[PDB]
Amino acid sequence: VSKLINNGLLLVGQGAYQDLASPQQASVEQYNIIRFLGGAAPYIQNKGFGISTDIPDQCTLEQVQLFSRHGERYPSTGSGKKYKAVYEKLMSYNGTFKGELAFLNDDYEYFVPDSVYLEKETSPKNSDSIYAGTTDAMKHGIAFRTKYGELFDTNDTLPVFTSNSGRVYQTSQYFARGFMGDDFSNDTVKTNIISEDADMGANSLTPRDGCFNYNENANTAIVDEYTTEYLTKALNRFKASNPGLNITEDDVSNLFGYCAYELNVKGASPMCDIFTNEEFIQYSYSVDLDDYYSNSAGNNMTRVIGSTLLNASLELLNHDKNENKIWLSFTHDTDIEIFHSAIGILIPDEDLPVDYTPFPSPYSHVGITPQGARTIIEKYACGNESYVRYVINDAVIPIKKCSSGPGFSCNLNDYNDYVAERVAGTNYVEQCGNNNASAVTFYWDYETTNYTASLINS
Amino acid sequence: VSKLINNGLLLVGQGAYQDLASPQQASVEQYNIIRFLGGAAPYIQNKGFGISTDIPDQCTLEQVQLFSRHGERYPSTGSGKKYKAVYEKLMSYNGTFKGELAFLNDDYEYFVPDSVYLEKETSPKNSDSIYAGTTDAMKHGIAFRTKYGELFDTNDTLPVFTSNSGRVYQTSQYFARGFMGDDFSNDTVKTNIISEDADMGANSLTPRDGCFNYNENANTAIVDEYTTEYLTKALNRFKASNPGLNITEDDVSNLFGYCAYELNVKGASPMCDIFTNEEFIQYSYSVDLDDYYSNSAGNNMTRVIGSTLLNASLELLNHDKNENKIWLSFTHDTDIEIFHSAIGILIPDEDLPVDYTPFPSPYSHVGITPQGARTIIEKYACGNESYVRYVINDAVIPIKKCSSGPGFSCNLNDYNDYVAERVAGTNYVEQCGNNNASAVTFYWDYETTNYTASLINS
Amino acid sequence: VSKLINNGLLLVGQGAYQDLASPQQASVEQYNIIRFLGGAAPYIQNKGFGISTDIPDQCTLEQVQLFSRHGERYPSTGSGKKYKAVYEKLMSYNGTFKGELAFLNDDYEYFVPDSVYLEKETSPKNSDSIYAGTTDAMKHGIAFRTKYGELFDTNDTLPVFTSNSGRVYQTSQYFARGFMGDDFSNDTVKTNIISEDADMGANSLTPRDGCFNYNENANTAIVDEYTTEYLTKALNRFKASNPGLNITEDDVSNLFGYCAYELNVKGASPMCDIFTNEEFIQYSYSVDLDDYYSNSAGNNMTRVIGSTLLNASLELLNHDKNENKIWLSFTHDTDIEIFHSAIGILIPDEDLPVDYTPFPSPYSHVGITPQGARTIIEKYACGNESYVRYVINDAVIPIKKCSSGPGFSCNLNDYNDYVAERVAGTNYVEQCGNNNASAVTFYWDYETTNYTASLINS
Amino acid sequence: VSKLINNGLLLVGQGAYQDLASPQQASVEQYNIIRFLGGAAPYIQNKGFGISTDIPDQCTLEQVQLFSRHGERYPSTGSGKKYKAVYEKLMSYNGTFKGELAFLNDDYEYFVPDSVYLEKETSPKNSDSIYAGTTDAMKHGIAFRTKYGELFDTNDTLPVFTSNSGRVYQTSQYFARGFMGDDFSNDTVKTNIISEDADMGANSLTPRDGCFNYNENANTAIVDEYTTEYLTKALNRFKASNPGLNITEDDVSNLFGYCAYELNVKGASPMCDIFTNEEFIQYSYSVDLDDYYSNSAGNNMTRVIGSTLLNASLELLNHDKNENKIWLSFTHDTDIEIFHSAIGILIPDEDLPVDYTPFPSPYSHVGITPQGARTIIEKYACGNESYVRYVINDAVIPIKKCSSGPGFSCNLNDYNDYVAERVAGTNYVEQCGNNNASAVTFYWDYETTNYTASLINS
């Protein structure tokens, strides 16, 4: 395939630049396909606000907390089944594909040829893609040591906190290897594998698993009211070039995710080429809708689940005497998204509408959890005060009305009040129905508790 | 001066890319200096939403309206003279400048050589800047012809509507020249210069001029509540390196515009180097506040004023049969802002806060009126329906709840209801206290009325 | 068509960046398709040597000479015929195209639907392409006034020198309009249209036309020895996906130019997608070969033709008292290429080989004459000396062993000796067999001689 | 310090784009500062020729050899101490620095905090630079696995060959770690540390060490003929702004390396801002000259020395049946340069001139050995033939007259003839005067010879 086809991520051409003095006068980031793929496609930085991510001058790093998703991965078992099916449905067309689907004629292989890769991080070992998730995680580890490394005492073991999802675990490991470089060994790094079982309660990197009363589908109804007409138009366009083509809107909907994962896996996907920006945007909003209403503030149970890690993170912030200053936590998009429902920095004031497409989406799921998502809390001293701020996918995201400190940070005293108010009236044990652990302890007790859950293939 | 210094517009270096597979995974556009300079600095495209600006497939162009600001300019008289005063205060420091202000020692000339350039477009003739306002307008005209020229009948004169401001008028001419290329002549283009005189009432590209009850400064005390502490900190930093340096917070505040203008004029400004991102962002928000409360929905009078052009534009869209399909109007940022107060697509639901810095700014002045600002309405037919949409600084901005047409456009029928809602209860004559023209007629009566005001230097 | 397809010019993907800290560590320019299209595709800057194109500090601009090709154009009459034929040959395939050629099924229109555009500059009026040649020329004019404008006395008419090729003429005009801005009129610009008739002799912007003894095909034999096997491999690949496909290597060869012009005309060409880099590179070298041996030092008659303009240019350089300091000449690639055979700055020491592909090509035709090619001679004073240097497609190209002056320039005294040696033993009248004008005079006599040749459609 | 200053590597601003339709029409890579810093500054990819670095379609990887320099490093002892001496001369200026040297006033620290870092790779651990040498090596390993890993059998140990230089050795380990990812261990990788001791003779990654008749300084008097006038001019400029500043031309010459090293160490260097492009280019050529005459074909001894690795590499390509297909060798720039003296693909036909500055430099040292230099031989099968080609710093560099295979590769049969031609009449023992090992055996006998030299700080 020509290097002129699918050789980048931008759904815009050179036309963007045609009347500019400088290419820097152009706004082309908006057209990045990843932003429309619901967090399934490769890592992308948050749009951000222009705030420098450097620690401000005259401030000194006190502590950092990373909450990271796994890196890019193969489809899940469930999705893989869907994509393999739609591939088989497509391939069983009797006819030669024309138009956007013409690539389907060209000895087009299914991008997951071995199902053992389903659920796995893409890596140099199983993928030819530059967007390999383990690569993402290693490069992140490196970058992260570069920036926050002065907080690391090399006489200390680096603790790593990870759920037992194999891909989350492998992320944590590639991250730690990036961070530690040629000092990485079984002795300089201790990984605490925190089980996803419901019996971990709030003592978890996936506290939703112990929250029995949380129904992620509490709002599927409202989400289903959002138009799917773009799926029909697209299906109809495919049929116009391919008469008799037997696929549905359901098949078409699956092809956005198919695009995202083939991109992850192969580094380029012809499946990405079949949709217009406008279809991408509507697909994207249907994902924001789904995630907002399942995983964020649209679901009235995410505050309480999200607060477990908000609390623990705040405890870490408040304890300045801990020898360890670097908190490395790895988990899933959903956990990070629910954590964000409690953080409250990327959460809209009102529930998302379904009767129109809002611009922008008041809730951007990919701005919070792309593949390789990173939610970082920086703590630093400036004079006689400590300040806290969030760096979400490499953008500083100021806490609303707590952004007066250097780098639009929140005085730790004010951050205390902010968190208090976010978590007011939450009670995990009681709202969730789970009498296991009521709070996170694993950041503190991992030396005396063995977090060695075995890895699951999810 | 090293080509490594001020060789671009981005307030970020290469660290943005350091853990990515592709540079397209980076979000660096948030860091563009222009976005913090309040519309004073060169043109920049609206961040946008990824909507293809192309006319959608199966859609046929019917009409386009352009509402354009003048291009990049030299400082106005007031600002220029304020910049000259600050320059002179700096030059009379006795001492060698150190730190960020050191460039002041280096035969640093004031950037406006001749005060005759105040108020004027920068151009190849008066400026060595690639960011020249006339270049921007000319390239825009070319691009605009390339996009919309199928709508132009070459047997017909191109009408141009411009206010009689020199810079605005010159913009219109460079644009028309870009548009018409080697067909440009006093025969193929007829420019209607619409006076900024208050006696023009609503029949004006600057209807605020005839609005007597409009007080742009009505909300200054609110606006002035916003923090100036960053100015003090910046000043103290300058003083720390330059003991006894005698300038004010007011001076420092003017150095932002000085930066924006020296950038326009010279193509680079050492003065841009003296601020942190955090200062630019607060500066930027002070401008958003001032313009929101003066020129937008913060001021109760702007909806009535803005509605004059909104109505006129709607009359144009409603009228199928006009031989002329390309509307080209040139005016100031203020008029376009007030216009947008009535358009209502880039207007926040609520008044801007003053007691903290919101992220993002709920009202982005530079998203609407950068130098060389362009507000475009495209009208196109898809099937048996006509659709309208806005392209503001090269980004489609869908109308809230009127964006289900192709390319997120509004059915002209629905667009009628939207406009009616926007202009409801407005009355120029009565609200403004002006009994001259009550409505725009210049788009229709310009062949019988001689619109030929003499140019003013403002 | 997806904005992920053909949305740039680079025959490389994101893979180039995958192991870098900064995207600026990547070399991706080498992959620009334009460089392989033999000067037929849009303008591209010369690779260059990193030499700043600014006039050095402490130097002051004395004089500038532009020798410019026309901008991007539609195919010629001859080429158009070839491309239309290959399109018709392709379209008459009975079968559905598969593979690279699949786009041929998709209601693929021939990109020159009206033959009146053959030979013409692409423009906003006849083309949707951002690469419109008139746009290129206008933007150049603007840029050129920005840089060299201090040499322009606005009390003077700008003289423009152009051959009577309609597209060259139109280039000169769009250039002059860019340069003059809103001061462009019949009075501020005087265009001297220099006939391409053989009877102009050396008094010509196309002195090859008066050189009867010049045989551009003196070396076709050696050029034909260069491998064409890549054409077979490509043809075979097309046939493998399309059994029965009746096209030849001749057809395939025509498709590189078809790619180049559809790119010019439409801004993107699916025809560009059918070749590998390796085919592009070999096509490209066959063009370098052809042009080197026809138009440059491989042909023993180009020195003498090239010296006519080298001499005239040098005369202009030596006459510091001329009121006019800006020499604007427009002509064809071949004339500029032959001029370069005499200039000697981009000419290899040995003739090009044909029995292998050399890397790099010792003679890069597209580095000298892309569409919109610009060969500029800058003259500037530094202290008590004047210096001369070449800026070829926006890159400074130092004269070998005359690059000691500021900006790697040649002292005008040394430049005199350099030109003397380049033109030693040339005699246009005698070597060419033409007893018309023996030397260029039109730079000096255009006020008293009327250069108003009528425009030809070539 | 402003993010507008030193925020990139390019010695050009936005003016490069000002008359283009697409920024991809610009040639800005010529302006990269790295290309003028003589291999001292961060990694940069070879400018290259547009050849796709992908394995050609229908070709199957058979073998790869990597010859890698150490990554970016701190200054060597000598250079570091020279930089410290210049820093101290500058700091003892009594006076406030003005002009380009003003940053010297701003609590400007010397960039090597601890002399223990001299000779060492920059890494996340000792450096906050994105350009860290270890990061570069690690990312390279990842990329290399992604490209070549189909050739790796995971049942087999990965052998690594490195010299015992600390920085080289560390490079090899970061690379291997990138390559092996979470499979890296002392079991999956076996590193063979090949001593730099002269007693190693030709069985060495640094065979120049055992070559007694090799005088790297044989040609210093030739090299010293090249102009130093630019140093005087630079110095006089520094003096003009700083009266009585007491530094030499020698000092100024060292400030180029200081720039390169501070860039490596800090990620930005104010010292890079003190030179013009024209000075960097002359500096750059002084380094090309020195290295051409010391480490390449300018020195009569390098072909014999280089031929040791050329022969060994050829023995590897000739031997189909080795279970190991991935050769990873790590050594210094000097060894790779001398290697290239025998490879002969980036070697000029003639000795470099000294009496002027050629464009381009006929021998580009940084094109061969930037920090993190990579010379790769790929061997792949196309049909019943095997092909060999070179990828130097991410660019395919075809062998002259052996580039007609797919991807401009050389049939291994032809490659044998090429190598034989290159090594003809060479004899290490006799030409070098060293009777220790006469040939490389370490690639074959490393499982029976213990290659385990102790690390040196050089």
Ligand SMILES: *[C@@H]1O[C@H](CO)[C@@H](O)[C@H](O)[C@H]1NC(C)=O
């Ligand atoms: C390093 O860690 C050990 C074991 O935790 C501790 O006892 C010792 O105090 C530490 N050494 C230094 C130099 O900090």
Ligand SMILES: *[C@@H]1O[C@H](CO)[C@@H](O)[C@H](O)[C@H]1NC(C)=O
């Ligand atoms: C914790 O959760 C697990 C799984 O739901 C359950 O078996 C156990 O009873 C719980 N423990 C308590 C004390 O509720």
Ligand SMILES: *[C@@H]1O[C@H](CO)[C@@H](O)[C@H](O)[C@H]1NC(C)=O
């Ligand atoms: C968070 O901590 C507060 C105490 O500050 C507590 O009342 C609340 O239950 C906690 N929320 C969760 C879900 O852990």
Ligand SMILES: *[C@@H]1O[C@H](CO)[C@@H](O)[C@H](O)[C@H]1NC(C)=O
């Ligand atoms: C806009 O038009 C409406 C009727 O559509 C009219 O009643 C109203 O006064 C107009 N507003 C202005 C301010 O021109």
Ligand SMILES: *[C@@H]1O[C@H](CO)[C@@H](O)[C@H](O)[C@H]1NC(C)=O
């Ligand atoms: C129109 O505007 C003028 C100038 O401001 C004002 O003085 C006059 O009263 C107005 N005329 C009418 C008819 O209201």
Ligand SMILES: *[C@@H]1O[C@H](CO)[C@@H](O)[C@H](O)[C@H]1NC(C)=O
């Ligand atoms: C302008 O040009 C005219 C006519 O060529 C000439 O006579 C006059 O001297 C010039 N005026 C100035 C101010 O240079």
Ligand SMILES: *[C@@H]1O[C@H](CO)[C@@H](O)[C@H](O)[C@H]1NC(C)=O
């Ligand atoms: C000049 O050239 C033309 C065309 O070739 C020819 O008719 C004429 O005779 C020539 N004049 C002389 C004096 O040779």
Ligand SMILES: *[C@@H]1O[C@H](CO)[C@@H](O)[C@H](O)[C@H]1NC(C)=O
């Ligand atoms: C160039 O000028 C020289 C005189 O300097 C002359 O001998 C030669 O004929 C000229 N060459 C051409 C072709 O005009």
Ligand SMILES: *[C@@H]1O[C@H](CO)[C@@H](O)[C@H](O)[C@H]1NC(C)=O
């Ligand atoms: C390279 O190998 C040849 C035989 O192929 C041998 O005669 C020659 O001496 C070798 N050169 C070196 C320097 O190892």
Ligand SMILES: *[C@@H]1O[C@H](CO)[C@@H](O)[C@H](O)[C@H]1NC(C)=O
């Ligand atoms: C090998 O090299 C050593 C160390 O430089 C040298 O002294 C010795 O003579 C050599 N040995 C032989 C066998 O030539």
